[PDB]
Structures are given as C-alpha cells and as structure tokens.
C-alpha cells in the first residue's frame, strides 16, 4: 500500500528479543539418571550459593 523505500510497508508482528553478556564464572552442573542437565548453582549468585 505504501512504497518500499519508505520505512512504512515493512510491517511485521510484535517480537521481543533478549541479549545477555557472558562473564567468566564457575558453575556446578547437576546431571540426572538419564544424563540431562536439570539444576545448576552459580557461586557469585548468593552467600548461600557460595
């Protein structure tokens, strides 16, 4: 309905994307009887976590 060169005419659905940043950390990983990761503990997350 509106020309291609203009910003208008390129309508799409509402989608939100997340971006995080990785910082070096030491994480304990818990496997399960079948061999899949279920729970993790981050040391810096809490004194309890430490």
């Amino acid at each position, epitope marked *: *309905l509106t*020309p*291609g*060169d*203009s910003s208008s005419g390129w309508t799409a659905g509402a989608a939100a994307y997340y971006v995080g940043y990785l910082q070096p950390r030491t994480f304990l990983l818990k496997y399960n009887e079948n061999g899949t990761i279920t729970d993790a503990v981050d040391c810096a997350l809490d004194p309890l976590s430490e």
Partner: nanobody
Amino acid sequence: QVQLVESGGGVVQPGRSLRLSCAASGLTFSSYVMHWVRQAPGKGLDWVGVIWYDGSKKYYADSVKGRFTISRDNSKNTLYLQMNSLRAEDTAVYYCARDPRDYYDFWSGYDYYYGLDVWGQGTTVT
C-alpha cells in the same frame, strides 16, 4: 540524502545529435523504474519514456517517436538517454525522476502505481 545530477545541457547547433545523462547518488539506483519528464517553457509537463529494472520492456509517449533511446548502466550509477534528432521543441527542461515501484511490487498480483518521489536538478535543452 538522495540527489540526481543532470548533465549534457547547453545550446548546440540544432539537429542530428544531443547528449543527456542522469546520475544518482548512493547504491539504490538499480532495480527502481525511472522516467524522463520534459518541462515545456510554457505548456506544462510531458513524458519521454519508461524503463524497467532490467530494461526488457520499454515504452514511449506519442509526442515523439523514433528519436529517443533509454539505457541504464549499473556500474557507473548513471542512466543514459540519446536524441537522434532535434526538432522545433526548444528550451525544454528535462528532469530525471525515480519511482519506487520495484520489480517485486509489479511481480505481486497487486496492480499499484506509486509516485515519482525524487527528481533531478534539471537542464537546458535547445
């Protein structure tokens, strides 16, 4: 910032040859249908022709026949037009204009015509 540059103006000896060319800033020159509009000194606007994205289909107005040829050079970013003769039509100002109707727009079943968005600086043809 979109700008189309006219060239090949000036008064020459009347007849048999005259060179016009229209440049285009940026890299969006190709794939956009382009038309040439001639401005009469006191009789309003008129048409010259039209060329598509690849130049397979070309059409000309009824005002002039057999004297105009339109071609586009993709690498040089300049469109070229030639007049094989110079008739009594003098002091006509020629503009080059870009129309956003791309190949995909007429590829889709939709039948739509947009508007001549950006125009050139203009030139003098005598």
